Write a protein that binds this ligand. Structure first.
Ligand SMILES: Cc1cc2nc3c(=O)[nH]c(=O)nc-3n(C[C@H](O)[C@H](O)[C@H](O)COP(=O)(O)OP(=O)(O)OC[C@H]3O[C@@H](n4cnc5c(N)ncnc54)[C@H](O)[C@@H]3O)c2cc1C
Ligand SMILES: Cc1cc2nc3c(=O)[nH]c(=O)nc-3n(C[C@H](O)[C@H](O)[C@H](O)COP(=O)(O)OP(=O)(O)OC[C@H]3O[C@@H](n4cnc5c(N)ncnc54)[C@H](O)[C@@H]3O)c2cc1C
Ligand SMILES: NCCC[C@H](N)C(=O)O
Ligand SMILES: NCCC[C@H](N)C(=O)O
Ligand SMILES: NCCC[C@H](N)C(=O)O
Ligand SMILES: NCCC[C@H](N)C(=O)O
Lengths: 549, 549
């Protein structure tokens, strides 16, 4: 059967085909070869754009204020080789075909992520209101859990034509997909996920506790409560494109994706000599953080770095999170329309924390000879840790444990606390769940934590779309299409997962980046090859519907 | 006409009458006079309770981990007398009768708060998408604003029987209020404010922009967007009890409320000698922060402070924000039912930042002879400052300007930034609005800022009730009623504005405190006088409806 992929629904362009086609993404007039384009941010969106623009014969100049990779960050533990904690993105749905294009291009290895109740996880434990349930398959759970699942399946089929939309995605039937999706847009933009859940037939006829347990742990594979306030359109996108199943981790860390793109030598670039990579073009490193972007008096865009160094470019791509164009960069107001500012400024970010330790061995696989149970499981709880994940690196390697992965309120619980207290709070919660398991005794190396909200170069883990934000996201996603733009707004571009329709998913950063590549190519008077048309060649036909004032 | 007051709707008890009645709040058996009751937190809820319990003949022992007054905090500027910035609560609706009972008791002076389009504000400026509107009265504003107001009035009357509910409040017609209110509870618990707005007839027939403007500035008297995700029941409570109009500030700072309660000598206490105040009972200061609460082997509650000192009490009231009973205090898990923990733990906190400067004089009242406009106005914008308030202390005193009062996303935009950058960001935004006004030149003293989310003794400005949180709030509000509780859960109490139905409003802290006074009196075998019945005497009859599982 044809795989589900992140194929629209908003802009069902085949990015994977565009990338794989042997003609390449297009071309730029030879007279513009070697011209510079500024790229703000060295995360996945900045680097994907830089890489493909280099291939088209431009000289991207990437600036990075903090760390290479942005929210793809894999921190090594003390003294180890190949043992990392994924601080940002960690579980990549195989529906992410644009992303996986680069993963494959680098020859990186992936393996199934130990999500609860999957073959990669031996066991799961749910702990709610002081009651603990062990499962090695879904059927092992109390009846309430299958009831929640059935009600969710049914609410999605009844309220979104889930099956029909997924079939259309499988077959890449664009006219059908748009018809279905475009029906849903004005009906669900303005409504929350919780409203979708509460007012569904399947859940309205169940107890409040079914809804509540759905929030805390779902049907035993993951909680939803942090996303309850979001526009249901966001959740539809996630489930319809299977963002929420068949996920892999990148072995050795996903940070190897941005780092590898930086160093990767394409077989063929336009203009550049053999052996050219982004790295070599920069002499090893991106430029420092950007402090200012303004229209210069020669018409170009002036980008000023932290040290006052000012350079001029025909085009500038920004990939930082949207608030940073006010908060961290002095970005001249007339460079975006007031409608674009409102979209960039009203956009909301979700908070997230993760706290990891390393352990001497995957001791959780040991059996409690009294009960038959693993000493420790993938843990979902209403306690402060919320989600605990177990990473097995082989019987003879240390294990890693994400003691707590938390979002929104539960992340904000940890905000002001240092790592020692984070870990202690988590161990004390996990001691309530597993009173007989000595986790502490196995812990080695250093403890690693993060709060994405705290960091001024991110002001959050990822966007979450509120009700009524469809029009904002539509403005942002379409910004790379500039033919109708006032001339004073042209030449600056945006990309990244906040521009995307699917914010907490790396595929959205990749796809928007590729749209910007097309926009920038076009800006330099370039164009796609006639046999491999690109995003902006079809955008007016199959792009996101616009809503009324 | 009889005033609107914060009279239910959930528990329409006449706290004001209770407080004012000459008999007093009740009594406790003489044998228990002088016994201690621990109070965690010296904000308004802890201090009200402590004050009323002292009057009944107990010895409250108040602990405070940080600053007296909690979220009633008035910081004096360098070198000045009587010139303060309100860092927490600042505008107290006159419908807050229990609160104003204590304000009057202390003889404190109040004056109308300079909200937009009131007599206390001379002018207001709205700045949206780069367009600026000046108004000295509502009619000065473009027609869109009156439309938004009409639609909101209409959505409230149509969807909530606002007029009826308000009449029932004016008349303190308890059966009618409850009938009207109880109808709304199951219908709106699970739905957001934005949903109520979008799906109203009045707004559904207006452009998206009408909704949007309503979020950003309302109808020209205040924005609603940070409250859009909350349960609509919360909002109903606000508007029905006039929390959102006729607001006063306390002259010299509202922190004079908690500080004067601490020092106030009642005419008559049971047991204590004349001249007794909370201060004199404590020898001048509350005890330090609490680190632990547990059941002791004598059957009392053990409270352990930061320095390891452990003291035992027949009753403990905690008034810190609910998360802190896991995050900051080791509070023995069996002291609360699991249902209670879940309420305490799931409760969500809103973020808030304010940044104030002092100016040499109220220069904003000067006229621009070219335009006839004030040099500066009460400012509502979509720019990052959001709301700017102007505080006139008289022509011959310095003025105070709250450069930016922001909530949620717009507060999170400032989170990691220091005060200098906060003030500069705000002055730059205000320069875009008022390009001809030199604010900087009038600024003297020190700048003052806060972010309530950042402080570990608060983990936010105040609760905001999410959809589906009615049951949690019902559990917490009712926790002072302990006759059916397991014995192990009795004797600990909670109060404060997160226990209340009206979280960002001081009256809710006062009303819950008073309930807990009742509970604690009852716990010590005391009771109200027959001619002045108290909260728990009528709670089972007029209390908040419970919802089904
Ligand atoms: C906690 C968490 C878990 C996640 N889990 C998943 C997952 O399981 N699966 C999945 O697919 N996706 C996941 N994601 C999302 C994925 O990681 C992102 O969508 C993607 O990494 C974002 O890429 P980006 O290039 O848009 O932005 P970023 O990586 O944010 O890149 C922007 C870069 O801009 C830089 N920058 C900022 N300001 C400046 C300045 N003034 N000058 C120069 N540079 C600047 C930043 O430092 C950063 O490096 C997760 C994200 C988080 C936060
Ligand atoms: C930014 C903001 C604006 C507001 N504006 C308004 C307004 O305009 N009008 C209005 O009516 N209301 C307003 N409020 C609400 C009002 O300020 C609150 O409702 C009220 O002050 C809350 O009082 P409380 O006693 O419940 O809690 P708190 O004031 O939080 O007091 C609890 C105390 O417990 C202490 N504590 C915490 N942990 C411990 C520990 N482990 N041991 C000992 N002590 C501890 C804290 O330090 C704190 O002093 C506002 C609040 C804020 C934050
Ligand atoms: N199970 C009830 C206690 C949960 C605890 N307050 C926590 O957040 O972990
Ligand atoms: N809404 C939960 C966050 C989604 C995130 N991409 C994750 O998979 O963890
Ligand atoms: N409306 C003009 C732009 C606003 C600017 N990004 C700000 O946050 O203030
Ligand atoms: N979040 C809106 C209410 C906040 C507060 N009571 C105020 O008037 O500022």
């Amino acid at each position: 059967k044809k795989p589900i992929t992140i194929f629209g629904p908003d802009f069902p362009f085949a990015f994977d085909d565009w990338l794989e086609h042997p003609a390449g993404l297009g071309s730029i007039p030879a007279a513009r070869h070697g011209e510079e384009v500024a790229i703000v941010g060295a995360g996945i969106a900045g680097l994907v754009a830089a890489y493909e623009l280099m291939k088209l014969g431009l000289k991207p100049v990437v600036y990075e204020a903090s760390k290479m990779g942005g929210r793809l960050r894999s921190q090594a533990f003390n003294g180890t080789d190949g043992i990392i904690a994924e601080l940002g993105g960690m579980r990549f749905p195989v529906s992410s075909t644009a992303f996986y294009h680069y993963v494959d291009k680098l020859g990186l290895e992936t393996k199934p992520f130990p999500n609860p109740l999957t073959p990669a996880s031996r066991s799961t434990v749910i702990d709610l209101e002081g009651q603990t349930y062990y499962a090695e398959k879904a059927a092992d759970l109390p009846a309430l859990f299958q009831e929640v699942t059935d009600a969710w399946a049914d609410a999605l089929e009844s309220g979104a034509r889930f099956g029909d939309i997924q079939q259309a995605i499988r077959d890449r039937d664009v006219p059908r997909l748009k018809e279905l999706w475009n029906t849903l847009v004005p009906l669900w933009d303005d409504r929350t996920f919780y409203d979708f859940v509460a007012t569904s037939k399947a859940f309205a006829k169940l107890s409040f506790q079914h809804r509540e347990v759905f929030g805390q742990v779902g049907f035993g594979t993951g909680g939803w409560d942090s996303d309850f306030p979001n526009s249901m359109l966001e959740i539809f996108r996630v489930v319809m494109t299977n963002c929420d199943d068949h996920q892999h981790l990148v072995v050795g860390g996903v940070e190897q994706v941005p780092q590898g793109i930086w160093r990767h030598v394409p077989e063929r670039c336009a203009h550049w000599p053999e052996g050219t990579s982004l790295s070599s073009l920069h002499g090893g490193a991106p430029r420092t953080g950007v402090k200012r972007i303004a229209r210069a008096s020669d018409g170009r865009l002036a980008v000023t770095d932290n040290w006052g160094d000012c350079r001029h470019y025909a085009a500038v791509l920004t990939t930082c999170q949207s608030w940073l164009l006010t908060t961290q960069i002095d970005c001249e107001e007339s460079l975006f329309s007031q409608k674009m500012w409102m979209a960039l400024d009203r956009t909301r970010y979700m908070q997230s924390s993760k706290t990891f330790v390393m352990v001497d061995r995957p001791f959780w696989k040991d059996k409690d000879p009294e009960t038959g149970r693993d000493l420790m499981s993938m843990t979902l709880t209403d306690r402060l840790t919320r989600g605990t994940y177990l990473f097995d690196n082989g019987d003879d390697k240390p294990g890693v444990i994400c003691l707590s992965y938390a979002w929104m309120s539960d992340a904000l619980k940890m905000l002001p606390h240092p790592v020692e207290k984070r870990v202690q709070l988590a161990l004390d919660a996990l001691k309530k769940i597993y009173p007989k398991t000595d986790i502490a005794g196995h812990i080695i190396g250093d403890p690693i934590t993060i709060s994405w909200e705290a960091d001024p170069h991110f002001l959050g883990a990822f966007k979450g779309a509120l009700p009524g934000h469809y029009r904002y996201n539509q403005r942002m996603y379409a910004h790379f299409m500039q033919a109708q733009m006032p001339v004073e707004q042209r030449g600056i571009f945006i990309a990244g997962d906040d521009v995307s329709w699917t914010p907490a998913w790396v595929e959205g950063a990749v796809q928007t980046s590729l749209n910007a590549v097309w926009g920038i190519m076009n800006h330099f008077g370039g164009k796609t090859h006639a046999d491999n048309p690109g995003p902006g060649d079809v955008f007016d036909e199959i792009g996101q519907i616009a809503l009324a004032d």
